[PDB]
Amino acid sequence: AKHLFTSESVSEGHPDKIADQISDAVLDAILEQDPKARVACETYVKTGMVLVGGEITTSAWVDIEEITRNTVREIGYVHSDMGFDANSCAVLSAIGKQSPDINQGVDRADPLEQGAGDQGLMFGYATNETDVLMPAPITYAHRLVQRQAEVRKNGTLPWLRPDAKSQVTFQYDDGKIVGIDAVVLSTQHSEEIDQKSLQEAVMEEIIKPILPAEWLTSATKFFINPTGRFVIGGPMGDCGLTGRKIIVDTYGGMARHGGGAFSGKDPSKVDRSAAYAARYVAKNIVAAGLADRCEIQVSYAIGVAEPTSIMVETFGTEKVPSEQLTLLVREFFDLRPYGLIQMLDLLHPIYKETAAYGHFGREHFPWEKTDKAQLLRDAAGLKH
Amino acid sequence: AKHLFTSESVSEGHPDKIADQISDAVLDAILEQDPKARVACETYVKTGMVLVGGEITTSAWVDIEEITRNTVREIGYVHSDMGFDANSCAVLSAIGKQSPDINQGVDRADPLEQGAGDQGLMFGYATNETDVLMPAPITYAHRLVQRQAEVRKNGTLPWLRPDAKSQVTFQYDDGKIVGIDAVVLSTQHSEEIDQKSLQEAVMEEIIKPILPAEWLTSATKFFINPTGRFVIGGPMGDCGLTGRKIIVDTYGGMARHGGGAFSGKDPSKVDRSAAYAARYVAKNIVAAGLADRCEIQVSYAIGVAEPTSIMVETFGTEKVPSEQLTLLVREFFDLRPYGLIQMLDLLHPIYKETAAYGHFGREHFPWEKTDKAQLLRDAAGLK
Amino acid sequence: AKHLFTSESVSEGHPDKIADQISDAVLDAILEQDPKARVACETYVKTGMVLVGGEITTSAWVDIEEITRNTVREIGYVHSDMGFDANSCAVLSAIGKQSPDINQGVDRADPLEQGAGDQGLMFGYATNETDVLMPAPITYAHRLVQRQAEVRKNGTLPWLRPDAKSQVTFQYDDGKIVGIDAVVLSTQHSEEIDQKSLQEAVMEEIIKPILPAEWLTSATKFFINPTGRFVIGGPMGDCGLTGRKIIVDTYGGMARHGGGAFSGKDPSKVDRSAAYAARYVAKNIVAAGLADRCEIQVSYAIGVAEPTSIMVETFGTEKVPSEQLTLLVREFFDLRPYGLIQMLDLLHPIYKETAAYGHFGREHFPWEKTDKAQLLRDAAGLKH
Amino acid sequence: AKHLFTSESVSEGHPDKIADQISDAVLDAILEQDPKARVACETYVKTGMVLVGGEITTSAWVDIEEITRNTVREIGYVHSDMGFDANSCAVLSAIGKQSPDINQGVDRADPLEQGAGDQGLMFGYATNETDVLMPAPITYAHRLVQRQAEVRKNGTLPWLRPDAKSQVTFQYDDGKIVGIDAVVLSTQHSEEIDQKSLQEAVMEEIIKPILPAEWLTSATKFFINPTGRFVIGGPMGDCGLTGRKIIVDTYGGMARHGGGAFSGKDPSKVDRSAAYAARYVAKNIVAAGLADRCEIQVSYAIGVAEPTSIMVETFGTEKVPSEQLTLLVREFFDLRPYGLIQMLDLLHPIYKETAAYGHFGREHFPWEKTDKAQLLRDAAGLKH
Amino acid sequence: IFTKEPANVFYVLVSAFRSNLCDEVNMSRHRHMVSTLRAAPGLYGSVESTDLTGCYREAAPTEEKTVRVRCKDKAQALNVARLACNEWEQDCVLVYKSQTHTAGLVYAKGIDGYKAERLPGSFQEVPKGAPLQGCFTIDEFGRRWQVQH
Amino acid sequence: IFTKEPANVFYVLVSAFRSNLCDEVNMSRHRHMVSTLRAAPGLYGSVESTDLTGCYREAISSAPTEEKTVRVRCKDKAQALNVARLACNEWEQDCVLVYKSQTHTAGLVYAKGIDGYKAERLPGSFQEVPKGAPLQGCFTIDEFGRRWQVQH
Amino acid sequence: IFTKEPANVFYVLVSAFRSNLCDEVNMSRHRHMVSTLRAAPGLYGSVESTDLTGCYREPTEEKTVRVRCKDKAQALNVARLACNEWEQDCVLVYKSQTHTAGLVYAKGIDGYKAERLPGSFQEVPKGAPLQGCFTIDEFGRRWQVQH
């Protein structure tokens, strides 16, 4: 029957997402400079300071501080009142180690056979609830935050300030979405605005234009900056750790996630590669329509070319037996780490965009392409 | 149907869990010295550097440095050549401090009516699979790594060293464990021991104990330190960030999770407290037998006493109207933050034990206690 | 579920079955003389007159009355008191024989291309209830009357006379044979015998050895010549006609039936051969595990070799999609009449045995062969 | 859920139905003379001879010859070239009369209480697909053949001759009617008419006015005398029996059948009466709306007043538990033979009407009245 | 459900005449248009039956005297019917093939109003449970059009 | 589904205009009316795309017929919508289909005249054909069967 | 289920010593023999818990002993040959994690029998107690099979 479901998305003005943006900005830099790099970088966000630490394996030379300050500038933490400034803040670098020696030494084993980077497990989820196969609520929350940031940047609300968070609660009755139960929005605001103007403005420029008027109801409730005094935002407001905001990037708790932070890790790292892969394949699946939605779990042991475990789940939404389904999975896609790499060719510095507002749910991301579905189309016959 | 499932559990030796134990020990010490304080701290782990920082509205006064040193000591990283020596550990503290007494003297308002710290959603999952009312796989990997930890501490395999991970794959038939497809173990060790002797020894003193015989067959596939080189490990091995091992702390990914790390968070905040409360109600529900496996999504708004949204899910394993079930939940339980604080009395310095090896599935923990279940079953009706 | 289902069979001693036996014995001898012949013969049976008439094209030379009397003798009506005797009864051969067409048009050009002899429709049914792939009650009833005749022949109860009718009512829970509710057995008996001993000995020598003692309960009711007098049986009491008892021949009433009388019909005639092929493909589909209980309707427009319509019905027990199943049907079996002929080798002098006690469910019959089933088991490996 | 279904009918001009007509006309004659009689007459039909014989107990006095000649003449086989004559056909009555005194002598018995005259079993069906509560295809096919007979009689196409047969194939989606796939109509025709113009004429005067063009597609195929020559028609070309088209009499094979040839059976004969009762009660059931399509079966043990089995079948289209349903059934209806007699009042010379064009679906026949249905509906409280 | 009792492909359609709010003069108006159509059946090619009552719930059901007419010509006769409704301003009419008893309604104004609705689910049914639709009943037989779900 | 990719609260609605059997003069009529609609984008409040066609049994035995149609993206729940209605009224057009872009489903309004609102809401689905069965109210744009769906 | 707690590869098994013929003297010999078992921990190779009491409604109730032996069959062998010596034939065994196993009826030094179709064991569902009760720690427990 009817039951609430709730998902949230943070602004790209949030400290944790700030750290992720920083990390994958460094990643895009190093990657542009080298396709074959092996990088895992982490970013700590604190009031007066920002730190980056980790390891890089390549030939590239990279200025960390300017990457960081560019990033903050994009976000806009450029004045004391905000509690954080791109320029004056302290950047702390500990990554280095710049050791391309080990992998440059000898290269004769086939890449598709080169064992998994490190042990791990991950998931890829897909559905038909929306166009983009993502779950509805997480997508709506992403729309909310990105619209907020857009208003801040274009200047329609000059007094807006980068940090913000959003949470939405829908009534899932019989699977379909009848309407929103409630929406809660928190924003960083300049000191000038008073509360009432703020609530009015945000209900105006954000809530209505983004949400379906039908889902918008009187019974639906709206909580906007319940404290309302949020001129303090971002780091001085709260701590920031890379990948700490792990779920928001994903399906927003709609499905089970593996447990490896996307940002600050390169396609060499098995986590993102495999996760992109799982999302990609499940997307091709639901695009075929074999199941309204599918969950995919894949588990790698370190030094293993092949997935230790591959589980498919349709939640009964399957139109065909699940076993030949599994067969098709293992056939049509090479699940080897470098193999799915070649399948998706991630070696392009693009992740600075996927830094925030969902790592799936955007077309330009390559994994979101779903050609092979047609091949899948042929492999299975008619439903039932 | 039949399929495979996998989960993962880490040793205390892994850097992420290291930072987690660190921050949680901090929180337990401060809680001991002061119940009502507010705590938000994070820990970072570099090669020889450990960082701790956050806002702690407390009257308390304790050196974070010596606490960290003693904790790492207990972990045993007391030798640089391991990759980390507790004596040498570079300690960085930036912990924000503030006076909470002034705030509480200002508020003068009922606890229950006081709103949630921050907006956030969280889950609680339970099931009748385990008689500890957990999922099987994460529990097995937990017993695995902790048995390794124990057999190291007691020095039975002294050359063994702390850092270790376990990734385990079961075969589920029609939702029933028929056998373990594969078990993968990695562990830190001295250098002198051979890889093969190591695999043999660990299969003996780790694998055989925690794994039951029947699921083990020839078909079961074992992969132990496939690199074979895990002297190099620990912090120098890899940087550990507080909470990054969230899922493997929660449910092994058997069920959903919201994304708020447990460590460094007093019961006051919504994240950890609500997580406990959800697992608690779910466990009591299953103990009332209302559903065989159940997941709870509870969602709070910042500053708000009322929890924005409440959802129960039974995967059809319910025995009653799910809406009636929700009604019963709201009856028996005050989902307010202060409400669950009351119902579970989390105001006690205990979380150093929830540091590592499973937050849920250890009876001494308050939320794991299942009292209202019976009364819930009494509220239930037919069955 | 709780529902009681009944079927009913007859002995060979009953008039109608006598008619059919006569007709098909004629057919058997004739077709033996010439396989290529065409025969449509019907037999009326009255108090003492056996009438036989129909259309026959062949070059054969057969006495009607000879086979007639011999058949009646084999049945056993040899004495006045039975109410009938081949030595006594007068035989009326009304068959008009015209030449076989020797023209080259009906020749080699193509048997498969040769159009259907006559319009019509027929049914096949198969189930997974039994090893014989036929509904239970009809099978048990047939086995009952068979036990009866076998007694009357081996000499166990000589005072039995050939006419006998049996009827069984099974209980049904969840469509699983649970309990036999009622048993009605009327039989033809000599004058000397007495009613009570008859009831007893009949219950003993026939009912027990054929019904599973379990479904026999205390509450199980019995009716055995409840009229208490069946001295004068056979045709004298009542008219017997060709093929009228068509139900008992097919399915005992579990399945819907087309209406073509099988007895006394040459194989080239569409009805009998078509229905046999129907039962054939039904058995093959059921044996291939593709369904639990399947029904087949096939319809032929006179002069058109191609079946007008082919319906396959799985009652939800299809393990593969029903239409893909239908495709399978059209592919694996040629359904043109002469296609059936080649498929089954029907042009063989067999059916005299097939006159009575079940037109299906007796193995050595060609349509009953489950050979093709494996291929069908092959053509689809999906499980649901 | 897409399947082709097929049904089959014959004009009265067909020899078999002719035989049935003969029997029932005899029956109506006798019943007119005396209601209480017992009649079991059968009629064989050869090329030039019609044999009539049966067991009859009555005080009646009825020429078989006059009746037969009248009936045949009314049908129209009044000429040699037709293939059969009413005036020169040979009439043979094998009728053996029993004494009505055995009927008068039995007394002091509840007429109701008396056991059934003869064991049996039968299925009456009903479906709300059509307002006659009959399977659509067989009803349309009756309308077809009847229209043909009508155009023969009214003189519009006098070259048309009585014998004619019909075969229709409908599409079915979701169990629902969509289109007619195929239609086959073959008739006897006078020599003067051609093939082609006959095709045209049958297309117009019969097919068009009777078939809903919506069901008629260009893709829908047509067959009219596919052999292209049917001058020799009637019994001359092909033998005919009494009760050898038991299917088209009842349901066109949509529903499983008991197997009692109705014609020539007196009401007191259990088969005809009981089957009437079955269709009657099933029609009342569906009319009350207690279910959408119900098949009733009833079985009777010889010498018993109470049936052995009364099984209702709803195909899930029930609106109430089949068990409460069965209780209701045995509540309102007394399936005692004389009971169903008094319920239906069969004691009237009316069956010459039910000769052809289906025993069911025709209003004035009392068993089609649906008054009981209201008290049925009100018996169980149903609100949907 | 396929009635199959009335004639085959012969068409049947209904009309109201009571479109505007002129209750009594509306009644006479209807009657006069009835006289018009019935007086010249040939052009209409139709058999009239004026007893019926047409109830449009239209969110407060309005009931207007209505007439069902059987039109033989697959378009021509019903076309004449459409014309009549047009001149008498009657907005739109229902048509259906009796055997199938299913057809959408056609709107028809101007010279040749050829505007027949899509979604032609069904018609001539009485579920007797939910009256929240157009009451179109003759001899207390509420004949409502439906769709499939 | 919830087609998030398309624009938000906008209503996308279709129009046919080819009402009477006027085979090619009706097509010219169509082109004319499309031009007229494009002529006043403001009050029409819509962008037009003319690829779509619509296909019905039409309950008049002759044959299912199809008409060229146009999709227009009105921003106004009513204003540009009402303009579309008044247009089809002018063009003797009986009914129109409007579905709200984000939900991707909303019922039809067979309102005409000057100031009439006949707001039906179908069973809440639209533009959704998996190429299974084309029986229903027939649509195609960009060779996509895209028609509403009734609940089951 | 699976009880998750006890050492895995360990073998916990329940046995009754009292026959049906008498009760109190069967109970005396019960405590005697079970104490003999208890006293020797090497052959019986197990720990004992005497709380458990069984019923077989077939409620024939008797005092029972739960012994946990490491040896997969060996101390189990001592237990089963011991029940042989006490003429008792009914003895249940189960492995901790599975928390079930079939039933063994093994007298004779090598006479060794194995059950067929074991589903589960040592849980009561509170629904239908027709099965053999096994009540310990104020909790009933029975064995099971899939349906």
Residue numbers in the entry:
A (entry chain F), C (entry chain B), D (entry chain C): 1 to 384
B (entry chain G): 1 to 383
E (entry chain J): 2 to 60, 64 to 153
F (entry chain L): 2 to 153
G (entry chain K): 2 to 59, 65 to 153
Question: How do the authors describe this structure?
Answer:
Specifically, SAMase triggers open-ended head-to-tail assembly of E. coli MAT into an unusual linear filamentous structure in which adjacent MAT tetramers are joined by two SAMase dimers. Specifically, each SAMase monomer forms an interaction with a MAT monomer and another SAMase monomer, so that each of the two MAT tetramers are joined in a head-to-tail fashion by two SAMase dimers. The interaction between the adjacent MAT molecules is weak, with an interface of only ∼170 Å. A SAMase monomer is an α/β protein composed of nine antiparallel β-strands forming a barrel-like structure and two helixes positioned outside the barrel. Two T3 SAMase monomers interact along ∼1,000-Å2 isologous interfaces to form a C2-dimer. The MAT-SAMase interface is smaller and occupies ∼600 to 700Å2. The “cracked egg” structure of SAMase dimer pushes one of the two joined MAT tetramers away from the plane. This bend between two adjacent MAT tetramers causes a propagation of right-handed helical twists along the entire SAMase-MAT heteropolymer. However, 6 out of the 21 interface-forming residues, Asp132, Val 133, Ile 178, Ile 211, Ala 214, and Trp 26, are present only in E. coli or in other closely related enteric bacteria. Collectively, DMD simulations together with normal mode analyses suggest that the entrapment of MAT tetramers within the SAMase-mediated filaments leads to an allosteric inhibition of MAT activity via dynamic coupling.
S-Adenosylmethionine lyase (SAMase) of bacteriophage T3 degrades the intracellular SAM pools of the host Escherichia coli cells, thereby inactivating a crucial metabolite involved in a plethora of cellular functions, including DNA methylation. Using single-particle cryoelectron microscopy (cryo-EM) and biochemical assays, we demonstrate that SAMase performs its function by not only degrading SAM but also by interacting with and efficiently inhibiting the host’s methionine S-adenosyltransferase (MAT), the enzyme that produces SAM. E. coli MAT is a dihedral homotetramer (comprised of dimers of dimers) that catalyzes the condensation of ATP and methionine to produce SAM. MAT is an essential enzyme and the only source of SAM in E. coli.
